[PDB]
Amino acid sequence: EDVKGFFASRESLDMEQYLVLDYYLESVGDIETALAHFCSEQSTFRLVHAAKVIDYEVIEELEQLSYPVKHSETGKIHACRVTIAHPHCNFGPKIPNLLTAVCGEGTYFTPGVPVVKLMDIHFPDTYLADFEGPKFGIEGLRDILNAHGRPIFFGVVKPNLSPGEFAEIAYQSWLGGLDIAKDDEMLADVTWSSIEERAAHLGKARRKAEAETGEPKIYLANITDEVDSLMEKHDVAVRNGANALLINALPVGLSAVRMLSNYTQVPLIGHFPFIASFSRMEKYGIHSKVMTKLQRLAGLDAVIMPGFGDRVMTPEEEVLENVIECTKPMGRIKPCLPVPGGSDSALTLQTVYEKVGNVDFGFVPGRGVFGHPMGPKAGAKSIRQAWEAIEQGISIETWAETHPELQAMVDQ
Amino acid sequence: EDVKGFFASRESLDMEQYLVLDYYLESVGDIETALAHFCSEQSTFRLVHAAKVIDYEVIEELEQLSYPVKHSETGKIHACRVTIAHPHCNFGPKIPNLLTAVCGEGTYFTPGVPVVKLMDIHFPDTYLADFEGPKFGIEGLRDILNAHGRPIFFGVVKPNIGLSPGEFAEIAYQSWLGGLDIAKDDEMLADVTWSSIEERAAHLGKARRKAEAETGEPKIYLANITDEVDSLMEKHDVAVRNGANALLINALPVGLSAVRMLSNYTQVPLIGHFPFIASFSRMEKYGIHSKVMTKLQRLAGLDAVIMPGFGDRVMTPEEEVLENVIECTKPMGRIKPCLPVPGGSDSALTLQTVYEKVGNVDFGFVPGRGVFGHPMGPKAGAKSIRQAWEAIEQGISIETWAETHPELQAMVDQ
């Protein structure tokens, strides 16, 4: 009768053979018993195949679960933070198998553990050695744009229009200094706007804008589609002048992202639909930073994510942790570009740069580029003017005094 | 203000062009304003491309959101049930594009609507006409097993992980001799180094064909082929050439779109398991109802869907389990019904209850206890399941039947 077979010191294990997982959970009844059950349900106690508790913290006794969950369990309720060593031989370097083991039936259906949140995953170099990661990363993107020492400026072309109407809006934004003009993540391959039609027009406007400005520009085409169509969509879009591709990572699945990443001739950027369904509860589900880390592992060169601003429904601390997962060392896996999209404009650029602490982010003005009173071109110009005020250590308001496009933005 | 441009009568629309979505939500501020914003964030107003409110019911005023979400909005909080017509021309017959539209950025990040649960999807026949659905479904599985007028009996071969393919094979073989239909891989044991798909399948395939010869009855070896999307077809071909005659996939981990791809390729029934689904479906008032995922799995082409089942220790309410059961079996255009497999705290002793709750024999039964851990072994454990079924058919109680049936009596004893 042995709960203690699911407990090990980190020092006693060959940690190259284990992933390290961090969970929040609420247990019912004897704590160590619940934790062994949790370990057993996610694995087997085979010495080679059991997941093992390497540390835990009891936070507090609770009078009640945080969320009502049907359970027949009897006993004291405790909140716990738990660290588990999980042998990666059980699943291998395969994203669906990883998900199955660390957030699968054992994770959420262990008797006596009704409330669980997967908080972090740490991968040893041995495990990472079987993954490719981003082909391009931050520095591949910067090389394409010849954009050095500054944030990367994104524009979501509004509205969503015929390929030729879209095209002239995008063209103006690039002329005024935007790096990347993208499709909305809800705008892929449809009847009024096929990927073939859109990509031809946008590719022509992109190469024209590169010749008129003397600077590289990116057309970011959304190719979200059925898994069996993604390679063909890549080929149509690239042939026509898209030089970066957007994918909705969770709706297509992280394994599909990995396959497209191995194929792609151009940077891939991931958007965030679906993730909130399992990451919003503060004490249940999967931390959004785990997903950001997984998208990077799968090979996205940039990750669009919720950003800063009081109207964004993700805590600021959580945004900053997602930012770090994109940029931090991870074996030989390239860093990807964090693109925190909040209630942003020329007026919020300084705040975001200050919160991030470096220039390795993408900025997406939600308003005041395409909504700017002087047009899309002057809206893009106001963003570049605000960046230059920041480089000079001058206030936005002082800079605006001599730069009319930025002044119009301060006016609203 | 044209809040009212996002409101329509169902009768004013050509409903063949819309999906019908049911949401629970908690709005902040003016109700109809929050609803129009919700509609707009998920779509645009263009007469062709806007999602529109066709009905809503204000349930109550709340003092506080059900969960404490970070939000700036101020105002009266209301719980609402809302019915939205969403034009399917925006996304087409494409599972990832569907998910992006109805549970994506707009769904969860509309200002003034911090708490949302997607409760149901209804698809018109027009939209269903571009999907295949299950190739085999319930009747294709019954035809393979020649199992009619009874549930389909599953057994998860256990000890689950860390066994030899030859060790695995003997236990599965006894269980088929005992009367089990389907011997399955663990959902956490796919293609790994001490137990490759090629070695398991060869051994299990040989035992299945022997058990068919020994019993005179067809038997299924259900092989777990969960893997990276780009390997699934090759794993299908290895398992099938070795004697797996059905394949198990973890649907959400591989992605519903990859399931659709394998369902078009497959020569054998595909069965979906449920890992991951709970991370978004457990909150009573947030995320996606599990029945939506069951419906989507069916649409993607799974022939059977393993799901939480009945029993006090199962962390899914009974009413939710029964809703999932019906999503598998109900009319859905020309989409075949799939076999619901509600896996609970089950044994020979709980079979009558499940039959009673379901109300027909179109389910899979998965004992958790008393088959492989039956005092007399795996053959006697499978036998006790079949004896319990026979007692149900005669309208005799389990304990009366057990008097003359030793294998069943042991289970009554424990």
Swiss-Prot record, chain A:
Residues where N6-carboxylysine is found: K182
GO molecular function: identical protein binding; magnesium ion binding
Binding-site residues for Mg(2+), renumbered to this chain: K182, D184, E185
Gene Ontology biological process terms, A to Z: carbon fixation
Lineage top rank: taxon: Bacteria
Cofactor(s) in the UniProt record: Mg(2+)
Annotated function: May be involved in sulfur metabolism and oxidative stress response. Does not show RuBisCO activity.
Subunit annotation: Homodimer.
Name of the protein this chain belongs to: Ribulose bisphosphate carboxylase-like protein
Swiss-Prot record, chain B:
Homology family: Belongs to the RuBisCO large chain family. Type IV subfamily.
InterPro entries membership: RuBisCO, RuBisCO_lsu_C, RuBisCO_lsu_C_sf, RuBisCO_lsu_fd_N, RuBisCO_lsu_N_sf
Keywords: Magnesium, Metal-binding
Lineage: Bacteria, Pseudomonadati, Chlorobiota, Chlorobiia, Chlorobiales
Modified residues (N6-carboxylysine): K184
CDD domains cross-referenced by the UniProt entry: RLP_Photo (cd08208)
Gene Ontology molecular function: any one: identical protein binding
Binding note for cofactor: Binds 1 Mg(2+) ion per subunit.
Cofactor(s) it depends on: Mg(2+)
Protein function: May be involved in sulfur metabolism and oxidative stress response. Does not show RuBisCO activity.
One Pfam family named in its UniProt record: RuBisCO_large
Subunit text: Homodimer.
A single GO BP: carbon fixation
Source organism (scientific name): Chlorobaculum tepidum (strain ATCC 49652 / DSM 12025 / NBRC 103806 / TLS)
Keyword Magnesium assigned: yes
Protein name: Ribulose bisphosphate carboxylase-like protein
Keyword Metal-binding: yes
Record-listed Mg(2+) binding positions: K184, D186, E187
